[PDB]
Design a protein around this nucleic acid. Structure first.
Ligand SMILES: [Mg+2]
Length: 299
DNA sequence: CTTTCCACTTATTCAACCTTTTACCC
DNA sequence: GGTAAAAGGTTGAATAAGTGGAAAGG
């Protein structure tokens, strides 16, 4: 395997994608063999379905770090935990910063990086500090870690969209270009509606709200699934999609298989611009485009 | 002793999917 | 009087996270 077979991508796109996908990791493993009885591993990771391996390669090729591996049969991962390589990641994020609640996680990661850069994690005081940091990262401590270090453990990130490149990267993870086919009392009996969405956890409500000001269109939907809730930024007005959404991503290129879902959705947009969705022949072409996009896509 | 990477797991958070109802164009 | 836009859900697997094992040189 080669570090840069695939092309690199734009660092703001990389950052948008990183706001939408991936997590920092701080492992603190019980370890017989370590002087202190624990060892650590620090890093950053992204796990995607096999379909979107090209993206991991894009990133690897941009940073020149990271390992790409199988992640079970269905998925692949990029993990950076080589310690000195984390300087490349730090250097990337200082210059092209994250803006979702994940920024907070990057702050934990930096702090843990400091402790390790000084080698404090090799002694009991440094392990204690990493425990306090890990306590706030992702899912926090295992029950077993809490017994070992029962010490007492220590606010929402509020940031603006930096530019459209960030937005192309973020959409490449969390966006959806959908062709909705409404059973309708129209002539053909089916209405074609283009839907754009970006799906996000509730914590990033402010970001989602500010997408409305940013794109000059769309609205927020609160959705739920019994115990769990999430948000959608949604655009359904056709003239907004054609004059606002489409040009943005024509100028700022999506990455991964979603690029192909996007061009397929634009093909339908040209058809609707021409009123062709209102004839049988055009409805059928759309039905065929939809059939083979998104979950229906083979290549 | 410690770093690094490789194999592999699991559950809920997303993307993606649908129907029905209301807005509004004409 | 007919097409567009929004309301109002559902669906399932990809992503969010994680775990053990161990090669390799320090
Ligand atoms: Mg995500």
């Amino acid at each position: 395997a080669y570090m840069s077979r695939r092309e690199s991508i734009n660092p703001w796109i990389l950052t948008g994608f990183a706001d939408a996908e991936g997590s920092f990791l701080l492992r603190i493993r019980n370890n017989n063999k370590s002087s202190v009885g624990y060892s650590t591993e620090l890093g950053f990771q992204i796990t995607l379905h096999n379909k979107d391996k090209s993206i991991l390669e894009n990133i690897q090729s941009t940073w020149k770090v990271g390992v790409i591996a199988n992640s079970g049969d269905n998925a692949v991962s990029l993990k950076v935990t080589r310690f000195e390589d984390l300087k490349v990641i730090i250097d990337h994020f200082e210059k092209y910063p994250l803006i979702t609640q994940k920024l907070g996680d990057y702050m934990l990661f930096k702090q843990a990086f400091c402790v390790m850069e000084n080698k404090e994690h090799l002694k009991i005081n440094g392990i204690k500090e990493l425990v306090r940091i890990k306590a706030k990262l992702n899912w926090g401590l295992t029950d077993e870690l809490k017994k070992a270090f029962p010490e007492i453990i220590s606010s929402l990130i509020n940031k603006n969209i930096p530019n459209f490149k960030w937005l192309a990267g973020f959409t490449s993870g969390e966006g959806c270009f959908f062709v909705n086919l409404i059973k309708s009392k129209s002539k053909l009996g089916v209405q074609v509606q283009l839907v754009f969405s970006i799906t996000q956890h509730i914590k990033d409500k402010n970001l989602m709200n500010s997408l409305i000001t940013y794109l000059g269109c769309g609205y927020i939907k609160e959705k739920n699934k019994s115990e769990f809730s999430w948000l959608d930024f949604v655009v359904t007005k056709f003239s907004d999609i054609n004059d606002k959404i489409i040009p943005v991503f024509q100028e700022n290129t999506l990455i991964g298989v979603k690029l192909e879902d996007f061009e397929d959705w634009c093909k339908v947009a040209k058809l609707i611009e021409e009123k062709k969705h209102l004839t049988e022949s055009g409805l059928d072409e759309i039905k065929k485009i939809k059939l083979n996009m998104n979950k229906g896509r083979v290549f």
